[PDB]
Design a protein around this ligand. Structure first.
Ligand SMILES: [Ba+2]
Ligand SMILES: [Ba+2]
Ligand SMILES: [Ba+2]
Length: 513
């Protein structure tokens, strides 16, 4: 029993099976057999002895098998539960993309009314709100500045009862955390309602506090395009109105001149300058995407566009970012403080490219001569249908969503495809009753995805309730090109984006053209 029970608890058939298939009759996987697994099952492109051997050196527990270039079932499991066994590509968990193009070519992690911790009407504001966001990799922040007592500018939500904070205190927090998560440029959106004098104060604080991090002069030779993330590495840049407004501030706006949306031109008239940025509410954006989908896309190739949540979302709720990304919208601002599927998708996207906060758009979204319109799909390089098969096998140590600490979870799994409208889909498994430790579903879903470059696959686990809304247990969102094949574990995250140390899903993924 102290083995029976013990090791029976700690025992997974699906794993046994997998090893068996891999290893066949042997009690061990030889480097050769492992390589075959890595290739045939895991579809690793760098599949080979070098890979195999590192996996064994890295994960094999038996000194004998290790020394002898072999993997036991235990090392097999370790591997599968490791960062290498993660359904989210380990290789993409480091900056690996081209960081030398104009900013407008990247999707940028952006926050809305960053200072807020809760609702838009009366909740608190705090420097913490800025620290958190920056710690989640956010690059684009928002400061709503108003005149404050003692000639000290404050920040809060204009015309509301939201609590207040100091512009200067905010600046220090930003300075301290701007690059804790990424070395790439941070952009500060200043919504300026300050008197001339206090505007002067702001400028003083900016210079004093940010010091040399602040970008206050154009980049040398940057003439026809926005600089690249690499060129602006380690810098903070301001976005706002440029010449009611003191020069001290206006002179600091370099590549992000706040501008009213004109329309989409083409030549050197109308469709704004690269160093100028327009903003669109959630609604206007949709309509524009609705009527002038390709115009927007094309507009977005050389220009940065900021989207922000509809005014009615006083609860700080969030819209779906995907719909904006499909149009090439880069600065899609969300309420970082609000847990939900929207932020789940948001942070899944930005976990890519080493989580640096700048994720390179697909090529077709970087072609000024683009005929793409996610809303009216025609043939083009973006069209590359794939057949995805996901098998939800089992779950391991699913957290109790909390509740009257006595009931046991009755887990079910939902799998969703987010992307161009035609690709969006969702499927769910059955509910296993009373088992969060090791529910087993062994259910498979298949999805057809025509524009994978814009897709994301999301796994969600709920605790089923007949009497009410199901409790969210954990989640994980993976960008299409980071989705690893074969047998893998999906490491579940909490509402708040936190990693759940031992809560996982064991799955088998296969992608075929
Ligand atoms: Ba604002
Ligand atoms: Ba129960
Ligand atoms: Ba329940």
């Amino acid at each position: 029993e102290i083995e029976t029970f013990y090791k029976m608890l700690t025992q997974r058939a699906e794993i046994d099976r997998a090893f068996e298939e891999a290893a066949g009759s042997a009690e061990t996987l030889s480097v050769e057999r492992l390589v075959t697994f890595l290739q045939h099952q895991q579809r690793e492109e760098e599949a080979g002895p070098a890979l195999a051997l590192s996996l064994i050196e890295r994960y094999e527990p038996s000194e004998t098998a290790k020394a002898q270039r072999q993997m036991t079932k235990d090392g097999f499991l370790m591997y599968l539960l490791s960062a290498d066994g993660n359904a989210f590509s380990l290789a993409h968990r480091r900056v690996y993309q081209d960081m030398d193009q104009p900013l407008s070519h990247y999707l940028v992690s952006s926050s809305h009314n960053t200072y807020l911790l809760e609702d838009q009407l009366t909740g608190p504001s705090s420097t913490e709100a800025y620290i958190r966001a920056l710690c989640k990799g956010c690059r684009c922040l928002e400061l709503d500045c108003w005149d404050g007592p003692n000639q000290e500018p404050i920040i809060y939500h204009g015309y509301t009862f939201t609590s207040k904070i100091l512009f200067c205190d905010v600046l220090r927090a930003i300075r301290d955390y701007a690059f804790k998560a990424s070395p790439y440029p941070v952009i500060l959106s200043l919504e300026n309602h300050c008197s001339l004098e206090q505007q002067r104060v702001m400028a003083r604080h900016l210079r004093a506090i940010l010091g040399p991090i602040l970008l206050d002069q154009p980049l040398d030779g940057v003439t026809t395009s926005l600089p690249s993330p690499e060129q602006l590495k380690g810098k903070i840049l301001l976005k706002g109105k440029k010449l009611k407004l003191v020069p001290e501030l206006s002179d600091m706006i370099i590549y992000c001149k706040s501008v009213h949306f004109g329309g989409f031109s083409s030549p050197g008239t109308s469709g704004q300058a690269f160093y100028e940025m327009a903003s669109f509410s959630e609604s206007r954006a949709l309509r524009l995407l609705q009527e002038s989908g390709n115009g927007f896309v094309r507009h977005n190739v050389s220009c940065l566009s900021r989207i922000y949540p509809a005014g009615w979302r006083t609860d700080s709720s969030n819209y779906s970012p995907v719909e904006m990304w499909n149009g090439g919208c880069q600065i899609v601002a969300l309420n970082f403080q609000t847990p939900g599927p929207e932020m789940d998708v948001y942070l899944g996207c930005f976990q890519d490219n080493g989580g640096c906060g700048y994720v390179l758009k697909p090529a077709f979204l970087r072609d000024p001569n683009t005929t793409f319109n996610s809303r009216a799909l025609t043939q083009g390089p973006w069209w590359r249908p794939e057949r995805l098969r996901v098998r939800i096998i089992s779950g391991q140590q699913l957290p109790k969503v909390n509740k009257n600490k006595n009931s046991i979870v009755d887990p079910k799994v939902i799998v969703e495809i987010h992307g161009v409208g035609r690709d969006t889909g969702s499927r769910q498994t059955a509910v296993i009753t009373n088992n969060g430790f090791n529910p087993r579903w062994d259910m498979e879903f298949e999805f057809e995805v025509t524009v994978p470059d814009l897709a994301l696959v999301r796994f969600m686990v709920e605790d089923y309730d007949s009497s009410s809304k199901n409790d969210f247990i954990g989640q994980s969102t993976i960008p299409w090109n980071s989705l690893k094949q074969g047998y893998r574990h999906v490491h579940l995250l909490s509402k708040n984006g936190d990693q759940h140390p031992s809560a996982t899903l064991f799955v088998k993924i296969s992608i075929q053209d």
